[PDB]
Design a protein around this ligand. Structure first.
Ligand SMILES: CCNc1nc(O)nc(NC(C)C)n1
Length: 333
């Protein structure tokens, strides 16, 4: 019989960003494994308590492998996994494991560091902007990596952050982008899921980056590049392991070296000196010659976090709740 695989999304496949990319991973798994797998998905599932009913129903319907693709499914996934010990659960970006519960994530911050390098080359104000969802480790690593990448070019760069308290709401994302631009940011990145920030950047004559997918068709003048998320090989490997009986609970983190994180082509507006530097830093990121959180690092209180010649430990990366010097908030509107 085919292995029944289900995907739980916190957003819509029509976001053209994060959920789109997870769903392209599901479709890659279907193409790679053919008749050996039967996939289904549910979109726009609310995070926290109400997700538990959806996850339980997919397990009750006979799914043997369930991917919960958002941070806020962590505790519902852990509870359903205890109730379904013969089902394999994989939770994106979480830190809770069990005999039948693994966690997976990308090192997207490797891409965000490269975006910061390019932002420092393209900014006219010296202020880069970040549209944030919630202050969880995934997002704080991306804010810090954007800032460190920019500071590798111009140590005087400032990063302004605005929080929308949602992963996906194109109206709120549009308003947040307008506010960052009004407060002097002219190269924007995000950890929300829509092309709204890009559309605002194009309207105002500013720059921004795609997130999880190439978003250039939404804003071809503003789109400098994008950090593309490729989940298809991970979803394939995981479904293969369950079918073959090799699956075990583990924490998986893949980056540019493993092909989970890739960069879109550069916009034609990027000048040759910036393009050359970007390609050198990209090669170094893939080879591990540079790491985004290599020392020396200080936090925003001036405390040393990592000495020169050391790297930030995996446990500090996993729990990151501190900001590098140069990160600030927006004035509340
Ligand atoms: C709709 C839920 N979206 C979501 N959830 C988690 O956990 N992380 C991300 N990250 C993107 C790169 C911003 N997005």
């Amino acid at each position: 019989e085919p292995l029944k695989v289900a995907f739980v999304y916190a957003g819509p496949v029509s976001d053209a960003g994060y959920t789109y990319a997870h769903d392209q991973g599901r479709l890659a798994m279907e193409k790679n494994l053919g008749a050996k797998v039967k996939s289904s998905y549910v979109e726009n599932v609310p995070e926290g308590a109400d997700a538990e009913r959806v996850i339980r129903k997919l397990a009750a319907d006979g799914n043997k492998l369930i991917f919960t693709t958002s941070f806020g499914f962590m505790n519902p996934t852990e509870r359903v996994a205890k109730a379904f010990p013969n089902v394999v659960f994989e939770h994106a970006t979480g830190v809770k494991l069990a005999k039948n519960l693994g966690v997976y994530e990308s090192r997207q911050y490797e891409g965000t560091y490269l975006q910061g390098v390019l932002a420092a080359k393209m900014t006219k104000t010296g202020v880069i902007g970040f549209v944030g969802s919630f202050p969880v480790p995934e997002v704080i690593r991306n804010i810090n990596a954007y800032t460190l990448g920019a500071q590798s070019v111009n140590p005087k760069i400032k990063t302004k952050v605005i929080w929308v308290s949602t992963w996906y709401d194109p109206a709120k994302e549009r308003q947040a982008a307008e506010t960052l631009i009004a407060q002097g940011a002219d190269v924007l990145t995000q950890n929300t899921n829509s092309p709204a920030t890009l559309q605002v950047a194009q309207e105002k004559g500013k720059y921004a980056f795609g997130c999880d997918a190439d978003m250039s068709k939404f804003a071809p003048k503003a789109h400098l590049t994008a950090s593309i998320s490729n989940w298809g090989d991970f979803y394939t490997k995981t479904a293969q392991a369950v079918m073959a009986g090799t699956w075990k609970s583990e924490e998986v983190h893949w980056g540019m070296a493993e092909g989970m994180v890739k960069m879109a082509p550069l916009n034609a507006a990027v000048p040759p000196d910036a393009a050359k530097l970007f390609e050198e830093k990209k090669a170094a990121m893939v080879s591990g010659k540079i790491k985004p959180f290599q020392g020396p690092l200080k936090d925003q209180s001036g405390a040393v976090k990592v000495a020169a010649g050391s790297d930030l430990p995996l446990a500090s990366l996993k729990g990151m709740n501190w900001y590098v010097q140069g990160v600030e908030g927006t004035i509340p509107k």
